[PDB]
């Protein structure tokens, strides 16, 4: 069950990057020029959690080369809900879906994301409920 989908671009502030049309299904736009130390908030837009526990974060991402990665967290870098490597998709506008889990407790969360290392692009963040 899907508690949110955040498009990339609808980040209240970011620090490195870049907007640019993409074309994924849906079309819109896509943030690119992503880099070691960049990052993304979407404190402007709270989500609501509606109980404690396990949530599957997805990403679509899309990547030349791969070695990317990011880390989701609470706006500000505190607390950390989770990791994750972001695969070579083979270009800039080939698009895939990836996942993990993490805990998030209930409540109002302000979400942010910031890279790790770069060399990927982001269309949207979607939150769903596992349990």
Known sequence: MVIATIQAEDHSQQSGTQQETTTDTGGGKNVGYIDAGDWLSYAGTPVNIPSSGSYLIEYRVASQNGGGSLTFEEAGGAPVHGTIAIPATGGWQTWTTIQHTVNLS?????FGIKANAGGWNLNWIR?????
């Open 127 to 131: 939150i769903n409920k596992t349990h």
């Open 106 to 110: 209930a409540g109002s969360h302000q």
